[PDB]
Amino acid sequence: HSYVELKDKVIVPGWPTLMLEIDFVGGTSRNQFLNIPFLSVKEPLQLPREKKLTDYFTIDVEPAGHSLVNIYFQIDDFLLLTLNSLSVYKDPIRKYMFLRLNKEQSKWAINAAFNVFSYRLRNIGVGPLGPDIRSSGP
Amino acid sequence: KHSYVELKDKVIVPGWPTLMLEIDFVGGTSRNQFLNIPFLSVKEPLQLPREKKLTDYFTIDVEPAGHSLVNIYFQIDDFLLLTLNSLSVYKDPIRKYMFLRLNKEQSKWAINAAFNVFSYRLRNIGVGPLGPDIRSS
Amino acid sequence: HSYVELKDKVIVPGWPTLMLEIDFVGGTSRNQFLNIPFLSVKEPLQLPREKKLTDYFTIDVEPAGHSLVNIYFQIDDFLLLTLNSLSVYKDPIRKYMFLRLNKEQSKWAINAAFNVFSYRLRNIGVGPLGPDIRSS
Amino acid sequence: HSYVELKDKVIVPGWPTLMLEIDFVFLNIPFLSVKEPLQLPREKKLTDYFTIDVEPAGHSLVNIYFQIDDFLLLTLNSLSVYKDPIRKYMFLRLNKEQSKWAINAAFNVFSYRLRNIGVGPLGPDIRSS
Amino acid sequence: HSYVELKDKVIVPGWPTLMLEIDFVGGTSRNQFLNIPFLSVKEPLQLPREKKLTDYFTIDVEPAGHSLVNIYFQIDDFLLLTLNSLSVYKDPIRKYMFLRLNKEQSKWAINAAFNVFSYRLRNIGVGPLGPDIRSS
Amino acid sequence: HSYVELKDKVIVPGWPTLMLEIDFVFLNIPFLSVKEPLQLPREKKLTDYFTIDVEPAGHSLVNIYFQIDDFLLLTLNSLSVYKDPIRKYMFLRLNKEQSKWAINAAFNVFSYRLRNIGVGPLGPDIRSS
Amino acid sequence: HSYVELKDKVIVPGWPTLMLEIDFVGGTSRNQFLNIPFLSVKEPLQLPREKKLTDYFTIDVEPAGHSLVNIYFQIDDFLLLTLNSLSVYKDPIRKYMFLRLNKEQSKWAINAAFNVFSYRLRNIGVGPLGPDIRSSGP
Amino acid sequence: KHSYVELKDKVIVPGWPTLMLEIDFVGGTSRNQFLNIPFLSVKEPLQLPREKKLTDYFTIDVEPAGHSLVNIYFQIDDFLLLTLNSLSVYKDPIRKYMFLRLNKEQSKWAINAAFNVFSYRLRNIGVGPLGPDIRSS
Amino acid sequence: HSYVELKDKVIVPGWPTLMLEIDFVGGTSRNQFLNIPFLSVKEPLQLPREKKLTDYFTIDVEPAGHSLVNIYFQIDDFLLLTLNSLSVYKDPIRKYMFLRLNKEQSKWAINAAFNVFSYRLRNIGVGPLGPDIRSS
Amino acid sequence: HSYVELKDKVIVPGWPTLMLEIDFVFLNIPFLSVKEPLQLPREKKLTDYFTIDVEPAGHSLVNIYFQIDDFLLLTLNSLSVYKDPIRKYMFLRLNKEQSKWAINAAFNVFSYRLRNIGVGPLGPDIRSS
Amino acid sequence: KHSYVELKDKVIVPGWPTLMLEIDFVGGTSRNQFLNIPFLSVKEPLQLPREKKLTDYFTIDVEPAGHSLVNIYFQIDDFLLLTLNSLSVYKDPIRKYMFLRLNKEQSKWAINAAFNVFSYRLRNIGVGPLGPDIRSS
Amino acid sequence: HSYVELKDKVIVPGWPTLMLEIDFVGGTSRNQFLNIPFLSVKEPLQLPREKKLTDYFTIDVEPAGHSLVNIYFQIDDFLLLTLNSLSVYKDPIRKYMFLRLNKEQSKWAINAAFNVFSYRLRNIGVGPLGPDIRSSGP
Ligand SMILES: Nc1nc2c(ncn2[C@@H]2O[C@H](CO)[C@@H](OP(=O)(O)O)[C@H]2O)c(=O)[nH]1
Ligand SMILES: Nc1nc2c(ncn2[C@@H]2O[C@H](CO)[C@@H](OP(=O)(O)O)[C@H]2O)c(=O)[nH]1
Ligand SMILES: Nc1nc2c(ncn2[C@@H]2O[C@H](CO)[C@@H](OP(=O)(O)O)[C@H]2O)c(=O)[nH]1
Ligand SMILES: Nc1nc2c(ncn2[C@@H]2O[C@H](CO)[C@@H](OP(=O)(O)O)[C@H]2O)c(=O)[nH]1
Ligand SMILES: Nc1nc2c(ncn2[C@@H]2O[C@H](CO)[C@@H](OP(=O)(O)O)[C@H]2O)c(=O)[nH]1
Ligand SMILES: Nc1nc2c(ncn2[C@@H]2O[C@H](CO)[C@@H](OP(=O)(O)O)[C@H]2O)c(=O)[nH]1
Ligand SMILES: [Cl-]
Ligand SMILES: [Cl-]
Ligand SMILES: [Cl-]
Ligand SMILES: [Cl-]
Ligand SMILES: [Cl-]
Ligand SMILES: [Cl-]
Ligand SMILES: [Cl-]
Ligand SMILES: [Cl-]
Ligand SMILES: [Cl-]
Ligand SMILES: [Cl-]
Ligand SMILES: [Cl-]
Ligand SMILES: [Cl-]
């Protein structure tokens, strides 16, 4: 297989957001969390409270330059189905993915030597013009 | 259908007074870092009527445009649009539906605040001593 | 006249550096100074006895974008002669000039509404590969 | 001779890393992807092989120039994943914030080292796929 | 006229803060500045281009006790308008005012025989619960 | 809702302690007398449960406001010697010197923790008498 | 039993002083000693050079507030007799006592987490007006 | 029997020149921390005769008043009492036997020095620019 | 007149110290101030309200050798009276004076081409053996 | 009494050392050559025996004055290689740079200690020849 | 045989303009530390002809004189010697072959650079405000 | 035996230099090397690449004052021959030697508590007037 890029275009302004929050080992201050707008979704995600994220969603942080980091992903079939069914951009999710962070995003990941303590997905809702904005594409 | 178009950098002209967009978030992390965006260069200061308020004329909306960048979307009432276009040093740049792009660092901040806007304002900043000489040059 | 750009190329790796230290009105004690590498010079800029860079310079910060700022300057006739004779890049200095700050450096000027409290000159030396680097 | 850039493409996602860490009188910079760990002889130290010079390259950006002795160069070029990127005369670019930090320190480096960073759980799969 | 007290209640938890940074004549390099949280404001106090707080203010430290000191101030007409329009507490600012330093803060003014070297304004932001706190 | 004060009376001489320690970008504050040690689950950390906000409350004094997640609140209220003092929204007052320190740091907290402090030789006798 | 407060009023100005000096674990600089004027005495204390203070006098430092500490005491009968016989205020000493320190006094005790390294009593003499002052009560 | 009475805070009047009591201890810990006590507000500066000295007019005595607080006790000769009362902005506050209270921090310092006074003085401090306007207001 | 030497002996171990803090034009943010123990005094030098040491002093750094520098000063009449009445060493202060910097202290003045940005006065206390030491 | 200088001649090349180390609110000063290591009783600490006072002695140089309790004095005088150099009242001189450092700290010492430094490979031969 | 004689400290006269010798090394360690040596006090500024250069008039050579100290040896052309002697406040101190001694700290620096001179110059420094009053006194 | 001083006078200006470089344990920054001009030599030193310096040349750093250090030396017969034959000052080298460093030289040695990591001899060549200078003695 290969690891396919999850590109920026899966973020569609005005649609609720799925956010991947990452905390690194030795992080003390919370403004050190790496928060990544991950996917725009038609409705918020809800996983079976029984199931854990760690069993359906593996992440891995690697260096990609002198101040860049990439995030690599393993996504279980059942979550890929769920995510593909929520995603506003049409079915962008594959089993093996990655996305590139910019230099600003990468600062704390480089400092913790890519050592991850905890991660999660969080549903982030929309602002006052959200419907208008998504309705307004050219 | 209308379109959301970009208020680009060219609308800031060096030497002219500045209209500054100031946004505060609800649960923004890190202290003493503000979101101050020079918004539009103006020939004369903005002055809204005393009884009416800004949020009757001006609505904003911060959303993500990708895995790192964030845009402020906004809707501008017809009255403030005429006023702002008439004051604007750049020729009539203002439209009813727009956005401006945040930079890499500002995006990070807005993301960290979960895009959650507590308030915002528009403030007049004057010019330094060489201002007159800079615009007339 | 026109305000002509003092561009990045007048900083040449391996030569001592002329630097502009700026303090903005407001902010916090925690705030570092804004420190702008300004000109690569043959040798340290020495001012006449009892003088300061404020005595030959006049600066004015103006926005140039949604997160960008330029610094505009007016440079006195004698300092103009001085900096043109120390400059590594051939005679880059004019009386009316500006330089463009990046989106990091502008952050500090914008939150102070462009208002400078003070500035002064600093001279910076070169490390152990300096001459080697400029030769290459 | 000329100081050639050690470009970002010497970093290969999936393989272990050499982190350049620098204390100005602090920054971490991934430096080189390697096939095996670096470990100098017991009775030498990095500064026997490696000189660092931090230098301004514009009105905001800063480069780190460095000179690599021949023994460290043949060693690093053998361990490197990317094929023989290392030369005697080189530089690398710091970002907007690293630069500022460097400027604030008047470019004075107090110390520096090279540290082996192992890889994540998908590491071997990323590079092998 | 009378010197009216700018009391503690004009600092309101959860709002940005206006601060007065004072340097006293004498003392030591080790001495921290005297930093007095002065006014809670809607937004940061921005001064007109090229101006400083010294240009609108006049301060005078006098003892008020065996280990107590007050700061007296005379506030210029335009800054008076400005601070009364940013104030969170409703219009607390008068032209002639004083504030009472505590027995810790007075220690620093008394050992300098009340003599100020300089002062300037600082603006301080709010943490992650700021708006939450002011709402409650 | 309202931020209620965590008063001094939650400190009971004789019983072990929870020390709030805070590093501004340093102060120790006895925080809560507890019957048994606090120890969070292995895979969480304090800042998952606990937000701190330092704020000026006059011309000299400073308070620390904080928000406590429900799990940490039920946990702390069970261990507490004083009966259920802990709420979701609270503050505590710093002294004249702590305040100054806080002001000098522009109220910026770099880190904070909660540490178990055992008791002295008369500890059990003090509380039991 | 209970632990009885040794109140300020046992300090009678103009009379020599008994001082309790406390040093904490990890104290480096001597201006970190906690010195407490403990009792006013008619004459200086002198314990049998044979006997140790630690056998007749136990101390214990506890928290009492967010920046307050209290000192708790166990006083052997023989020292209580001795102290009661020296004390200017009439017989204030009991077997189980405590006194409250203010916030200023408590700073280094809070920093060492109440961990005591060493303590002692010291006789502190009087100034030039001492007799006049003690003679002058209203 | 006489009594030792308190020289209270009210005898310091803002806007008037200050008579400052300065005490040095023998083995005081911590450097650059002085014991400077503003002592009495005066209409005109104090000036003792050149030949005579302060310790012929003024005697001080630092003692503890409890487990934390410390008082400076003092005895003031009849000549300096007349002089000080005549100079005092507050109406005749000075008596022959007095004390003033030290604060929590100063007590700690005096305790740490074992109350052991090396020397002391009385020094005139002037007024700032608003002084005149503050007392006549 | 002549510039008379303020010699080392006017610093007397065990007494508070009067110090001159100097900032030179140029250099680096990293540069410590040049701090010269200047006079041992009975008590702290207190200046009149609103005044600074620059208001009574005039200084001029000149070289005295291949790595040596002296500081020359002109001292105003009232400050002359003040420092002569606080001096521990009997009346050492004249209107025109100089003091000799050592090869370490001159290093800092020479690299700035003798050019001072500012100076101010500092007062330094004494440790726990101070009076003991001066008595001995 | 008088504060007498602890001169350089109390340092005897070849014999182990007592290093005076001082942290201003950092300097190492060889202090005394000793025949055997110093080790205080378990329940005491240096500052019980030893007071330090840093003081300016000219327009550039600084001395460290110190007072040595009688027990530490008899102990140090027995271990000393040079014969009984130690008195109750003493001082030592700092160099041009140590001084500057001391001045920069407003002479404020945060801590100080005495550390045993063993000897080199020729140590015993140097002193015995 | 000629001799290399010392340019001693006496040739620097306080109150007069300074001729400063500035030396840069090739691989000198430590940043922002320069080798600036005040070289000779002069009545008027030095000004070499525009076409000719310093290294045609002036040659320097840094060597060790022992286990710690280092001397700068130099050779001075006949033209610059006449010029420098005529400008020199001190009476004719310059000869064709000389040296000056470096101090303990400067020696260390020169040693660390392996004595390896990259370039050097002579620069005029003026006088402070009391200059006139200092030399005429 | 005794340890004989290797005095400054063995440095003869204008003649190439032999330099003893010393690095101390815990030295991080290279401007912390102690470099000592050791001997002036008629030609550069060249030891049999087979042989090590450590077998022919032992060094030892000792304290000699509150800010002074001395370096003590053991020099094998074969290197003494070699050094004596190179040395410009006539035959100054003995088996047991020492030299005194000044206070400036001693700073980093005192900081590392005299603990040596590595040392070596390095040949340092001469400047543009070197021959003239050595020819010019009075
Ligand atoms: N995404 C977004 N949310 C905003 C904005 N302004 C206020 N908010 C609030 O922040 C929340 C998302 O972080 C939204 O509430 P809701 O998501 O709970 O409906 C929304 O009401 C904005 O400009 N963008
Ligand atoms: N590079 C990398 N390391 C990780 C990640 N998550 C956890 N780690 C841990 O951090 C270490 C690298 O800093 C690895 O251990 P290892 O180096 O002992 O193999 C690994 O266990 C990740 O996403 N990327
Ligand atoms: N709280 C307290 N602890 C003390 C005191 N004296 C010594 N200690 C020691 O300090 C520790 C608390 O900081 C205790 O150990 P423990 O916590 O392992 O029981 C105790 O042994 C004291 O007076 N009070
Ligand atoms: N208690 C006290 N002692 C003083 C004072 N001034 C000087 N001293 C000296 O300090 C000592 C007590 O610390 C006293 O000596 P004595 O106690 O040895 O008799 C006393 O002489 C003072 O004001 N109060
Ligand atoms: N004093 C000294 N110690 C050295 C030297 N070289 C190495 N050392 C080591 O440093 C230590 C002293 O700091 C010694 O160990 P030791 O103290 O355990 O005997 C010794 O092994 C030297 O030249 N002088
Ligand atoms: N010793 C010395 N070397 C110098 C000087 N100026 C330049 N150099 C160069 O430094 C080198 C010695 O460190 C010399 O080259 P070389 O020794 O390779 O011949 C020499 O050319 C100087 O003034 N003294
Ligand atoms: Cl995609
Ligand atoms: Cl667009
Ligand atoms: Cl544009
Ligand atoms: Cl360019
Ligand atoms: Cl300047
Ligand atoms: Cl109030
Ligand atoms: Cl200001
Ligand atoms: Cl009682
Ligand atoms: Cl009373
Ligand atoms: Cl009162
Ligand atoms: Cl002298
Ligand atoms: Cl001043």
Ligand SMILES: [Cl-]
């Ligand atoms: Cl000579």
Ligand SMILES: [Cl-]
């Ligand atoms: Cl001379």
Ligand SMILES: [Cl-]
């Ligand atoms: Cl010899």
